[model samples]
Target chain A: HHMLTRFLIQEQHAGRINADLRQLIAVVARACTSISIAVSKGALGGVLQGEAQKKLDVISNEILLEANAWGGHLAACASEEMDHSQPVPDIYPRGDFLLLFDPLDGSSNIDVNVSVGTIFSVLRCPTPGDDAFLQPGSKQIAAGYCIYGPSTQLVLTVGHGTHAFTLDREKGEFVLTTENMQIPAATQEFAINMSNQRHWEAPMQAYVGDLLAGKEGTRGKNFNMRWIASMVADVHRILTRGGIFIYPWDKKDPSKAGKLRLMYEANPMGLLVEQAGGAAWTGRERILDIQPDQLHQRVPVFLGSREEVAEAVRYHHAHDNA
Target chain B: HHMLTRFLIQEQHAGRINADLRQLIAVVARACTSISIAVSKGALGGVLQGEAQKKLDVISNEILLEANAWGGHLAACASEEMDHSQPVPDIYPRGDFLLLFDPLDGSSNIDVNVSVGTIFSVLRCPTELPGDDAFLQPGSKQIAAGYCIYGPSTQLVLTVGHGTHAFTLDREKGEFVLTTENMQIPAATQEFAINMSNQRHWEAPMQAYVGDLLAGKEGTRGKNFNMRWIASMVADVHRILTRGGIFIYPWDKKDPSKAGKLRLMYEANPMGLLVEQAGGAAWTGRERILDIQPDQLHQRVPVFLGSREEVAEAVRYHHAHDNA
Candidate 1:
């Protein structure tokens, strides 16, 4: 019954979030709604032909930029699509919060008619510059993702418990679905890419091998696997049903620290996961505990059911110690 | 530029689909809009609790029945959700066509917050025999077929035999606008969709096929084929109909008694008709899905559809090794 605005206002009343953060999230949701409509049009973007996936990526990035820039709650912004952070021009009223986003995550899935989403992280602007968003995941004031699948869902947390809202496309509004999602400490379901099995490191290889072994192998119980290729979709499933999601350091890209960007993708998801009483780790350390130096840094993500993630961390820790 | 109504009228003018068929498509689209509204409500749509609204799939079944029956488009209708075909009672006039539908395909994903859809096949309503048997006709007998998916955007993809077309529901006007015409899937693809969790439960050929796909670029396939499993027939097929890819719901050892998981009448037949109409192919590993004469109302089959070449490639694994 509670729409996003009404729910946010309640948070405002509870003194957990401020007016700026509330409006900022609202603006992002509005942009996502627009992207949802565009995404549904499929191949109709140009003479109803060509890759709609390519069109949506740029369009979604532009939509987010335009919507966020004009909206007053944000003072500056950064995106996975852009090289540099953009501060709200002096013409606009200076705002308190900084925004960083992956305008459209999982764009590859879009071409194949799978769900894709936008991930965002919000932080209080330290001063009025690009570095305002160069903060660690734990410094996040609020974080959320809007997934465009069969439906549009906005999962958010304002340093409180993670809450989910499903978009009522009829009214163009987001209504609360679950008040607080609690990830079970233990889970038998795990999501990872077997396509990269050959490219994974020693610990990651051993860990996944144990998982694939099922009841007869090292693990006594059976485990299920899913790879939607959309982080938002996969993470949403893990949050809904207790599970683990892993993106480990691999041999394919040793120069890069990880696959998913830390600022936009990992941080926002990490905040939401941690808020839901789950754990987020970087294979070597806690996801939120990592000190961030770059606006668009990549990190391997290991998160979901607390117990499962701990087991993954134990594998990495053993490797780190040796 | 064309809306569904105008497009259907053109089809009528072209002497392809008849007025009753046109009206049938319109009524189904209307019902889909209602279902879309129901789906969009998510937790609020009364579908979640018993207080205000009914279960969405059941509500969807009613919407289709009421819409099709009152519109006088069919003699009888069969549903994936129902056990028997429901004949038009004395109150409503029966028409020339028979309709079979999965009112809400992928009902499992309905609660999990993913795409679900309405699938339907229209056939010539035959007389002189059991009315329910009329629904047992093969997919090749389908006069019309389509599905309306409730996703981020409500899309209605239809084929009246000329070619496959797609329509996007304009939410603001509550209209379905023609978005793509003469839709075609590529002849080949490096992508495949299947549930791998049942890896340990699959037959040998299928297991070997997916194992090569899972082995990535260095595997037997000699390519880096990607994988996706939304666990929804409509959602997966919708993607294939849009671009190039293959979707397989193969027979597994877990449920060896039954043919496969997807229903032939509601899920496979209609989707098979649509996929084939889209310059693609649909088969049941050994036989063309549209050619199979269905025996039961809810008979199931193994479905392999999409990019024609990939579908053939998947079938090769079955045919080559299955003599075992």
Candidate 2:
């Protein structure tokens, strides 16, 4: 009877409930639920390779299954740990929801006691019915990620404004913490991974150089610096505090196009940044507009306090001699 | 009779409470107490300009008076608003306790908002108790400053390293919530501030620069950038110790000589930078010496994370070339 009801509903929403979309949402949602449950346990400050990794792999498989179940909707679902999509049997079904993810962010920091999280983005098929699942990050129909820090929260946006919901452990539900968290326009602080100073480009170098000058610095006010390793943590802070965060393209990996996968990571985050009144971009172009050719395509991401991001984009445009 | 008793007590405890020292402490303590009272009265926002500022000024006067009562213990007291310390009367007394402050840190954001606080620092005499009572920032003495932030509760800290105590507000008694708080060192997350585009002129931007690059434009597997900026670091991120993040003061200032003022304008370093030690820094490479220029001095200094004072000293050497 339950299966019959679901099938009837599936038939009713046939166009909307494509096999891959259904499978993808179920798989990722299930993974999120399982991960949230595991993390709530003593996973942090404990071993990760044993049952923990096993459970995570199971979650990963579920995610892959959803992707493959959509049939040709996705070329593949690339992940941080997996070498390939680990395709589902063609005999079963296929998918159109090409997914990308970092199953767990800031995992190592868990031991030392730091907020860790997970990020995932969903991109649609580039053409209406094309088998080629490649689509630009700009074409994402939906994108969202969850933060399993001291507080288990999910930040998600589906083209509309972004909303943040906290997981109620007792009830096993996600209650809305913020319906629409608007990113402040300007901020006095900035966050960056300052450890790689030697590898930075001149523009980035010049920007930091001025900020260090303090009141005497070009801006003529004492500014502060903030850096957190996890993208979810850092981006969450920027959303709240109104400062700029940069992860620009450098001379290091010109071939990588950009560092993060456009569809999954950059697009979703880009949407959140926009919803929060901030800007998101690659070194040379807007993040949402860039097209992707493969499932695991990586792209550079620069985001933060709106004005500051604009300044960064301007620097990049000038630097590229565009 | 009460005055007599107090005087008698002072006379007997003269060894512990010098006239000058007593005067200084009395004034600051009274100011803190009064501020607490005022903060406790109305809504969470407390009072900003008119009555609040007026009351703060009254307290500032008392601080100035006691500061002068000391003998060469204080040079001057500079309130956040006052450009120079009001001169101590010539006949009565004059000492050194260059007081600098921000009578209220986040006063504007109050009203059941978030955390609003007060900060103050004390310094010693710069020059024979000030020629004209000009409290230049360079002279701070046995400094003491805290806040009456109207939040879930109010917290207070009085340090000679007795650690810090959190004070809660009870409407009935106007008493402090004495949650004894000891600030431990070696903060894991470093709270920093730097505009990255300006990196070219940065003098050794620290491990953060490299870390950002590796995580960013350069190295390894793909990752995203996480960052934040709140205007007031004090109220913005004191909770960072529990969480982790590095706050930075890179080579942002274009001018070399005048980086910025190091000492607290109205509060003590503990209130201002002890949070650094709690999990951050009041770092300027050369010394963890908030004690160095006992007198108030305005100088720009870089601050970083907590370890020992090793990182602080290292930053000083890094910039020594320009200083040299």
Candidate 3:
């Protein structure tokens, strides 16, 4: 698996690997097929059980299986549903790629018709003898997120530039819809977990309070607020309409650095936002700068139109002293 | 006009009138047509023109003209656009039927491709001269608000316990499709909103804070959040039937006695959040009790949601010190 990731990224860097992107697209497309089949068959009525988890295990194995069949070089795989790293066993041909994924990010939203998605990050595994097998998220060679919204859309970044694709249900194929999806530089709208206001410090509270003024308060402008629970939907909306999204560190639970996991979720999303000319930060820190403590480490994430994110960071700094 | 308002109210009270909610619908329908024509034909891109207001004025006059033409007992007219009362013009004939309106609410959203609407409140004028037009909002004769979303749909509402009708555009007839003709209470996937943390005061705010936390953050075992905001209340949740969300307003201002200006039953409940049994409130105050001060009459308002829960009380207590 490591060999595959190395080959794909190296070829991509050398401008010689268009086929690898196609293969990656195929993997996601096939996964969508299984997902559609599952939803249509009414298989996910309740939370996964022993058999259900096993079923997901099969799906993960099949993905690696297909990648190897296509002669793709890959090294290792990690999934939220799996207990530990599933190294391409010695029985099967091992390649030079590493894959990180959340097989189903918002599976709970599915039965209720809410938007959900799958997220993945592709990285090069450490050399054979090195103990760098679990390298941090910043080392990812490629990252992408696929949202199964009213229409399925895939947002991917290959480190050069980010692109977006939509599944044309009529054509039964994922077609490239946007070549370079750039997030707007600034916006008047803001989104946050208002329910966590008590857990918030003084600055965030002050900011939201002013926003609620609606032409009557001190902001002197009528600002609007939006909150969509799903991260992909929220991020997509921010990308489309220049705005800010905050999942900041608060006193609600000091142990939780943030609500979202860092390695697969925040890092990939931050890179995508950056590739689109937007900014991503961890309030007092930068998203890319953070070194992961674990594969599934959680951390606060604040990203969006550059200006608003800067404002948020400033607010955090201001409150740091207080 | 006063006589007509009394007659209509009495008729409704006695249950003797064959009042066609359809006629009330037609008045707004004609108003929309006139507004649309003025919008497309005029050169004003985003600014409200003297001519635009005049166009609405003429449309309201025409609606009154038609109301008189129909000869139903009507009352006094109160409109957001006109200055004071015009006695419904004695020459054209008048009704005791009261007309209340914000003829072109959210007009600013029009040019920006944001949803906008027209809101009207129909009240029965009092029977006696110099009578107070005060009654609990629940006791009002009738109310309705319609939005002409420039999207793919142009919807209308005419409520006389007929529930709200969702009309669609039929390109062939250039009229409504009446697709979702009558709607019942919406589903319980509540979409709530409140700026918590300022809990030192309003009882309304406290009530709403507890409810929102129950609905989100740490309370229920429901799925994750799905929130929405369109700035204009008229435009905010017209799409609420498909996906539920709550909106909130807690008394946070330094002033205690200053309850929100957005009328309870008229603008907030009747027009914005009344549909689908959606919730409505004032800074933790009972929405139906919020009386209009009519200062700067056309000022914008602060309101919460159209979803379930104690949003009204949140609106009430948002001003707790004032209650003291």
All models, DockQ values? 0.48, 0.06, 0.06
Over 4 Å off, model 2:
A1-27, A40-59, A62-76, A89-96, A125-133, A184-189, A195-198, A203-224, A252-257, A275-277, A305-307, B1-284, B287-324
lDDT of 3 by residue, A8-27 (tens): 45556788446555466456
Error of 3 at A137 (Å): 3.3
Which residue pairs show collisions in model 1?
A150-B151
lDDT per residue for candidate 1 within B109-157, as digits (tens), equals 6665667788888888775323677788888989989998877667889
**Reproduced native contacts, each prediction:** 0.43, 0.08, 0.07
Q: Chain A TM-scores, all candidates?
A: 0.94, 0.79, 0.83
**Whose lDDT is greatest here?**
1
Q: State the fnat of model 1.
A: 0.43
TM-score of every candidate relative to the true structure: 0.91, 0.52, 0.56
Q: RMSD in angstroms, all models?
A: 3.2, 12.5, 11.3
- Candidate with better TM-score, 2 vs 3: 3
Go through the candidates in order and give each one's C-alpha lDDT.
0.80, 0.53, 0.55
Better of 1 and 2 by TM-score: 1
Clashes of each: 1, 120, 56
lDDT score, candidate 1, position B129: 28
Which candidate has the highest DockQ of all?
1
CAPRI category for model 1? acceptable
For model 1 chain B, the run of ten residues with the poorest summed lDDT: B45-54
